[PDB]
């Protein structure tokens, strides 16, 4: 227990956490108090910044429309002199997801069931506009078949970037072998398009006194299970999140092998964003899928 | 700049950045009340956390020894089971820098001038111990020549990490050309070592009712001008901070070109920490310098 360590090292009986969040993370954006409440502002001086933020607006609006999960309200996208854009959204007073984890597991399962169960059914995988995964714009072209969508517009896209930027022989050869085996992980299963947050890392979820909050989405209609891959692989969610979720959407047969395929996407995306530290998990995951 | 644009776009009379330390991009941070008063604790689980925090301790101590600026007292660096470290320091109630901006400009100029004006004899560039740029340990080996120190132990070090992790051909080729240009940016000036805070982002300065406060240093003896590059590039300092500062330390010839070189360092550091988003301004800044 880190609080027990601090009490011992500081020789104190009380250790009462208090106070506001501070200036935050330089690379993420900055919060401001205003006349109407706090806001959070992201700035991107690149020419495709408006397209990025409009994708995030589209994602936040799609999630808000379900009424099932709490996300910050988008307020404005501003074009900047010199290039790029700023995106302003509502800022919530927030803490790490802990007490609200089981509630968020329920809400995330309801979100994934919303499309199938509702009144205006989206019957393809993809999305009506471009959304970015981190800095990389994605193709969301509608496709009837999920393994086709995911192989072509998620895995192949990442691997083409790796080939362009690293010319990596082992990724190229392992992908030529893996590509053909992907349908074995989906046969005999019904896969229904599910609206996804798209980037449900523990650093994109939090909570307040009312309930859990999720943010920084990169949404599309996908296989529900894909949502959970990044959540599992980087940790940070209480067990009760997954317990609540899978009470509503039990793990289908083949869940753990599909989990590898979905974690592969995230490793490839991290290799393209952060470099070669992520080559070893990417290749290793491909190797695990092949044997 | 950005704040005036936000005020207009949001039609708000007030706009006050969230200020003070806390959870950043790199470490967690939380205040606690204890039997002996409040403290602020930073936590990092990476193996190099102790080294990082010992560098911050040394930097805080060097700044406090001058008696010219207010900074938190460092209290303890604690090894964590399971790896990493916690760093406890004095807690100060703070808001973002506003009314005290011109006072901080005076203080920062007096800080930089202290090695020249005070009972201080440091006639090389560098520092007596390792300090970290975020996660990245720095070499602070003493050097008589500032453009040598900055090229070798700041720019080259960042670009060697970019080569290792991204193997980026354009970065390598542009750097080789820029290395040849660097001495010309110094206008034959005699650079005097100045004690720097080293990371004077607006998120690392604040104020209380006594005056301004600075924190999260990464200190070394450098060219005074380097201090201002991150302050300018990410904004957040009122104009009166720079007015007050340059009344005491006027811009030397070539300031505007060196500002690009010093901002380059910060873009490379963001490329290394935060990924590919910062490739474009890194390469673009080098190209601008080569024009």
Numbering used by the authors:
A (entry chain A), B (entry chain B): 0 to 290
Can you list sentences taken from the study reporting this PDB entry?
Glycation, a non-enzymatic post-translational modification occurring on proteins, can be actively reversed via site-specific phosphorylation of the fructose-lysine moiety by FN3K kinase, to impact the cellular function of the target protein. Alternatively, the sugar moiety on glycated residues can be phosphorylated by a class of small-molecule kinases called fructosamine-3-kinases (FN3Ks), which are present in mammals, birds, and plants. Further characterization indicated that FN3K is responsible for protein deglycation by phosphorylating protein-associated fructosamines. Here, we determined a series of crystal structures of HsFN3K in the apo-state, and in complex with different nucleotide analogs together with a sugar substrate mimic to reveal the features important for its kinase activity and substrate recognition.
To investigate the structural basis of FN3K kinase activity, we determined a crystal structure of HsFN3K in its apo state. We, therefore, designed an internal loop truncated HsFN3K (HsFN3K∆) guided by limited proteolysis experiments. HsFN3K∆ crystallized in space group P212121 with two molecules in the asymmetric unit (ASU). The whole HsFN3K∆ polypeptide could be unambiguously traced in the 1.67 Å resolution electron density map, revealing a globular bi-lobal structure with the N-lobe and C-lobe exhibiting a canonical protein-kinase-like (PKL)-fold. The two C-lobes in the ASU are placed in a head-to-head orientation with the N-lobe α1 helix from one protomer positioned onto the N-lobe β-sheet of the second, forming a domain-swapped dimer. The dimeric arrangement of the two HsFN3K protomers is supported by an intermolecular di-sulfide linkage between the side chain of a Cys24 residue from the ATP-binding P-loop of each protomer. The electrostatic surface of the Apo-HsFN3K structure exhibits an overall negatively charged pocket, decorated with polar residues, near the P-loop for ATP binding, and a sulfate ion is observed in one protomer occupying the space for the nucleotide β-phosphate in this structure. Notably, in contrast to a fully extended conformation of the P-loop in AtFN3K, the P-loop in HsFN3K packs against the N-lobe β-sheet. Apo-HsFN3K has an overall PKL kinase fold, and although it was purified under reducing conditions as a primarily monomeric protein in solution, it forms a domain-swapped dimer supported by an intermolecular disulfide bond in the P-loop in the crystal structure.
